Amino acid sequence: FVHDCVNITIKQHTVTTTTKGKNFTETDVKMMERVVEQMCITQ
Amino acid sequence: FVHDCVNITIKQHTVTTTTKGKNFTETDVKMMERVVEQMCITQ
Amino acid sequence: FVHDCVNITIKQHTVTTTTKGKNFTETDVKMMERVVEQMCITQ
Amino acid sequence: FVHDCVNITIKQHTVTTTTKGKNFTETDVKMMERVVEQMCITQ
Amino acid sequence: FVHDCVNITIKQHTVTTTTKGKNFTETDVKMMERVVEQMCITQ
Amino acid sequence: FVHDCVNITIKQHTVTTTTKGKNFTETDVKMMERVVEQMCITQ
């Protein structure tokens, strides 16, 4: 009944901004309303 | 009944902006309303 | 009934900004309304 | 050399919003970079 | 050399908002970088 | 060399907000960098 579960995620980044009136600059983003996340289930 | 589950995701990036009145610049983004994510299930 | 659960995430970043009236600059962000997260379940 | 200068501007409005994740709703707006406005000149 | 200068501006408004995550709602707004405004000049 | 200078501006408003995470709601606003405003000049 053996399972296994692995996940790697390296996220390198470098932002820069010089605004003159308006700027938002939202980097990597998510949103999940009724999220139900799981992993390695053996019901 | 053996399973296995692997997933890697490296995400290198470098943004830059010099606005003069309006700018948004949203990098890698997602959204999932009623998300139900799983992995390595053996019901 | 053996399981296993691993996940690594290194997140290097370096932001900089010199505004002249408005700027937001929100780096990596998420939001999950009715989140129910789990890991390595063997019900 | 008589002049005259009149200008009226009534601006009635009524906004409303019920957001669920993003909304801007900028009402009557302007912007003028090197503006040089005058009135009733008799050089 | 007579001049005259008049200007009226009544601005009635009524905003309302019920946000659920993000909202800006900027009402009547302006911006003028190197503005030089005058009135009733007789150089 | 007679001049005259008049300007009236009544500004009635009524805002209201019930936020659930973020909200800005900036009412009538301006900004003028190198502003040089005058009135009724007879150089």
Residue numbers in the entry:
A (entry chain E), B (entry chain F), C (entry chain D), D (entry chain C), E (entry chain B), F (entry chain A): 175 to 217
Per the authors:
Prion diseases are infectious, fatal neurodegenerative diseases primarily caused by the conformational conversion of prion protein (PrP) from its cellular form (PrPC) into a protease-resistant, aggregated form (PrPSc) in humans, cattle, sheep, and cervid species (1–12). Forty-two different mutations in the PrP gene (PRNP) were identified to cause a variety of genetic prion diseases, including genetic Creutzfeldt-Jakob disease (CJD), Gerstmann-Sträussler-Scheinker disease, and fatal familial insomnia. Most of the mutations do not cause large conformational changes in PrPC, whose structure features a folded C-terminal globular domain containing three α helices and two very short antiparallel β sheets accompanied by a largely disordered N-terminal tail. Here, we report the cryo–electron microscopy structure of an amyloid fibril formed by full-length human PrP with E196K mutation, a genetic Creutzfeldt-Jakob disease–related mutation.
We produced amyloid fibrils from recombinant, full-length human E196K PrPC (residues 23 to 231) overexpressed in Escherichia coli, by incubating the purified protein in 20 mM tris-HCl buffer (pH 7.4) containing 2 M guanidine hydrochloride and shaking at 37°C for 7 to 9 hours. The 3D map showed two protofibrils in the E196K fibril intertwined into a left-handed helix, with a half-helical pitch of 126.4 nm, which is remarkably longer than that of the wild-type fibril. The subunits in each E196K protofibril stack along the fibril axis with a helical rise of 4.82 Å and twist of −0.68°, and the subunits in two protofibrils stack along the fibril axis with a helical rise of 2.41 Å. The E196K fibril core features a compact fold containing a long β strand (β1) and four short β strands (β2 to β5). In contrast, the E196K fibril core contains a long β sheet (β1), four short β sheets (β2-β5), a long interface comprising residues 194 to 208, and one disulfide bond between Cys179 in β1 and Cys214 in β5, with a higher β sheet content (77%) than in the wild-type fibril core (55%). Four pairs of amino acids (Lys194 and Glu207; Lys196 and Glu200; Glu200 and Lys196; and Glu207 and Lys194) from opposing subunits of the E196K fibril formed four strong intermolecular salt bridges, with a distance of 3.1, 3.4, 3.4, and 3.0 Å, respectively, and Glu207 and Arg208 from the same subunit of the E196K fibril formed two weak salt bridges, with a distance of 6.3 Å, to stabilize the mixed hydrophilic and hydrophobic protofibril interface. Lys185 and Asp202 from the same subunit of the E196K fibril formed two strong salt bridges, and His187 and Asp202 from the adjacent subunit of the E196K fibril formed two salt bridges to stabilize the two hydrophilic cavities. In this case, the charge-flipping mutation of Glu to Lys at position 196 disrupts key interactions in the wild-type fibril structure and induces a rearrangement of its core.
